[PDB]
């Protein structure tokens, strides 16, 4: 039917097509020059215009993969540069393309991208703003070959809108930097979420994934019927598999097909989809995936009815276990948008466990009559933690809240690197700052969202440089008990204090010229070292030492001649503190 290129070109528009072709090629030819890819893009774009003018034009009939594959193999250096990958050009289609996906190197050997000065950046932006955005688009795409292209394009437009609104302000840095930080964090989270979902699919199986998807979908579309939700879980599962495989083209088609489906049965799924279903092809699925929870019917029976009281349960269960259990989740999840998905799964595993013990006993109904009774504690566990932690967060504020976490975790896993403990504690604080501003009904979902990517990054790291069997236990265990296992970590009684070191607790006046972020990291780094040296110190002994240090920095940063007060009063602080911490 017609021409694929022409079609995609008409749907996307020239501007989007060119930016997407750039990203796609950058993700395969990660080592080729920018000017080389631009040549490529122009060539393909010109070809695509040929097809838009005449569908019968040469090669215009060819499939996207084939056209794409032919273009890659057309690169001169290829073998000289990539070597192995060049041998892919010797194969037929299904093979050739699969051969390229295998050589798509994740975690390249490229330099870190350094953020330029707001001024140089803004000035480059005013000059060729297009080549300014494409170069960076190219730089980020080659470093993240797995990042879904259209999404990367959505972030790029937000960056563009920020340079536009900021490069014209009185104080540019004041405007730009703050939003460049939000975008970075946002981009890293999305990137991590993505690897997280794919790793989970791989590590735990499609069953676990389907369970997660049912719960998640039911919270969002509480009005949808179970048959509808199972339909979506199935398709959603096929989408994640191919999108994880890395094949951009297949992934995009599956996503478009799904969003189209959902939009066509809009009224049969959710009322909060109107906006998203009006958007262009490029942003539909992305919009839908971010859509807000629809409101629940209000005309819903009780869970006790069909799952706890009604005999006919084991019968209905033995008939199709997973389906029955899926029904339980659907029912429980659409009634609880306020629960995290993992909590929902813990309740479902608990219920499964019960049906599996009771349905085989003499009087079934009398064995599982009090099951909802066993849910209470599972539910209270996270709620209580969130309540306790957000109260504390509101008490001391972000920075001081980060310190509280710092002391807490260093004490639980002293074997961890100081820079890693600092990074972890800081990220956790931002979660507290993002999620505690929410009402009690949106807090667990918020925390789950952020905590999962933080806990995963943590584990992949530990997977590389192991440090504690305890961490490994929590990291390799069930994805449903991952967080509870970390919450259960106890202070490390075993650990042996790190012998004193003055260099470690030696401060200089430079901490006064430092920026807010740099001196925090400076102080926090020391705080971790302090706890690693005297792990048996009280929250109070520590508060006292931290207070003595506070005034220290003050009565020395505001003193005539610094680098001395710092060595004089410093010697004192350390000698006195050593005594306090007996
Ligand atoms: C991990 C991918 C998510 C990040 C999205 C990036 C989108 C790229 C679009 C335009 C380039 C912006 C140029 C500014 C670079 C500064 C990057 C940084 O702060 O780390
Ligand atoms: C229709 C699809 C039904 C999916 C199966 C339903 C419920 C199973 C409940 C247990 C969830 C297991 C998660 C796996 C894990 O322990 O990590
Ligand atoms: C000849 C060269 C052919 C190169 C192929 C270009 C690839 C173009 C587009 C792929 C991305 C399509 C985006 C559709 C959005 C669908 C969605 O996820 O909702
Ligand atoms: C979050 C749960 C996703 C909700 C609805 C499915 C939307 C379909 C679009 C595909 C997104 C693929 C990831
Ligand atoms: C509102 C979230 C509060 C975030 C504060 C950051 C401190 C992290 C420590 C404990 C938070 C525990 C939250 C547990 C909910 C995750 C979902 C789950 O496991 O059910
Ligand atoms: C040397 C680097 C290797 C990686 C080491 C991993 C370090 C883990 C450090 C701290 C654990 C994070 C705390 C997890 C949140 C649990 C929530 C709670 O407190 O209830
Ligand atoms: C027995 C070991 C003695 C070590 C010497 C102690 C010197 C003090 C060292 C580190 C304190 C770190 C400061 C953390 C509090 C930051 C709070 C704030 O910003 O005001």
From Swiss-Prot:
Residues the record marks as site: Not glycated: 2, 18, 39, 62, 71, 91, 104, 134, 157, 172, 179, 188, 193, 203, 210, 238, 260, 272, 284, 357, 370, 387, 400, 412, 430, 434, 464, 473, 498, 517, 522, 536, 539, 555, 558, 562, 572
One GO cellular component, as annotated: blood microparticle
Gene that specifies this protein: ALB
Residues holding Zn(2+): 65, 245, 247
Entry annotated with the keyword Magnesium: no
Designated name of the protein: Albumin
Residue span, Albumin domain: 1-184, 185-377, 378-575
Organism, as annotated: Homo sapiens (Human)
Modified residues (Phosphothreonine): 81, 418, 420
Carbohydrate-modified residues: 10, 49, 135, 160, 197, 223, 231, 274, 279, 311, 315-316, 321, 349, 376, 411, 437, 442, 492, 523, 532, 534, 543, 571
Alphabetical list of SUPFAM superfamilies matching this protein: Serum albumin-like
PANTHER family in UniProt: ALBUMIN, SERUM ALBUMIN-RELATED
Effect of residue 267 to G: In Nagasaki-1
Effect of residue 363 to V: In Iowa city-1
Site (Aspirin-acetylated lysine): 197
């Amino acid at each position: 039917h017609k021409s694929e290129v022409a079609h995609r070109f008409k749907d996307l528009g020239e501007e989007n097509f060119k930016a997407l072709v750039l990203i796609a090629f950058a993700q395969y030819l990660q080592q080729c020059p920018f000017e080389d890819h631009v040549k490529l893009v122009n060539e393909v774009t010109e070809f695509a215009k040929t097809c838009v003018a005449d569908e019968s034009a040469e090669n215009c009939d060819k499939s996207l993969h084939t056209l794409f594959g032919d273009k890659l193999c057309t690169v001169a250096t290829l073998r000289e540069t990539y070597g192995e990958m060049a041998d892919c050009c010797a194969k037929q289609e299904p093979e050739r393309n699969e051969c390229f996906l295998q050589h798509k190197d994740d975690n390249p050997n490229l330099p870190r991208l350094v953020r330029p000065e707001v001024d140089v950046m803004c000035t480059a932006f005013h000059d060729n703003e297009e080549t300014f955005l494409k170069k960076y688009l190219y730089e980020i795409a080659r470093r993240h070959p797995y990042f879904y292209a259209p999404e990367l394009l959505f972030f790029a437009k937000r960056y563009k809108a920020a340079f536009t609104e900021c490069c014209q302000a009185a104080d540019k840095a004041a405007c730009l930097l703050p939003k460049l930080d939000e975008l970075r964090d946002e981009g890293k989270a999305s990137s991590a979420k993505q690897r997280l979902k794919c790793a989970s699919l791989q590590k735990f199986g499609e069953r676990a994934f389907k369970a997660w998807a049912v719960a998640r979908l039911s919270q969002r579309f509480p009005k949808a019927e179970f048959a509808e939700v199972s339909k979506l879980v199935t398709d959603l599962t096929k989408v994640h598999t191919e999108c994880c495989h890395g094949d951009l083209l297949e992934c995009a088609d599956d996503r478009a097909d799904l969003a189209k489906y959902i939009c066509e049965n809009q009224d049969s799924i959710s009322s909060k989809l109107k906006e998203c279903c009006e958007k262009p092809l490029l942003e539909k699925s992305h919009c839908i995936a971010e859509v807000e929870n629809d409101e629940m019917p209000a005309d819903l029976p009780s869970l006790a009815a069909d799952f706890v009281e009604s005999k006919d349960v084991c019968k209905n269960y033995a008939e199709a276990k997973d389906v029955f259990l899926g029904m339980f989740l659907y029912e429980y999840a659409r009634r609880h948008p306020d629960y995290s998905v993992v909590l929902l799964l813990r309740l479902a595993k608990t219920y499964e466990t019960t049906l599996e013990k009771c349905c085989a006993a003499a009087d079934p109904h009398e064995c599982y009559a009090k099951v909802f009774d066993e849910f209470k504690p599972l539910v209270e566990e996270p709620q209580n933690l969130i309540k306790q932690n957000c109260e504390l967060f509101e008490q001391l504020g972000e920075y001081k809240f980060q310190n509280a976490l710092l002391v807490r975790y260093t004490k639980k896993v002293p074997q961890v690197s100081t820079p890693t403990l600092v990074e972890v504690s800081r990220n956790l604080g931002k979660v507290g700052s993002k999620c505690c501003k929410h009402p009690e009904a949106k807090r667990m979902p918020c925390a789950e969202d952020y905590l999962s990517v933080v806990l995963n990054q943590l584990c992949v790291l530990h997977e590389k440089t192991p440090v504690s069997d305890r961490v490994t236990k929590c990291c390799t265990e069930s994805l449903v008990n991952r967080r509870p296992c970390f919450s259960a970590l106890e202070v490390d009684e075993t650990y042996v204090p790190k012998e004193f070191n003055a260099e470690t607790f030696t401060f200089h006046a430079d901490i006064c010229t430092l920026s807010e972020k740099e001196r925090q990291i400076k102080k926090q780094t020391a705080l971790v070292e302090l706890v690693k040296h005297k792990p048996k110190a009280t929250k109070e002994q520590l508060k006292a030492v931290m207070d003595d240090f506070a005034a220290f920095v003050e009565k020395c940063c505001k003193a005539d001649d610094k680098e001395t007060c710092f060595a004089e009063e410093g010697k004192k602080l350390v000698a006195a503190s050593q005594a306090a911490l007996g």
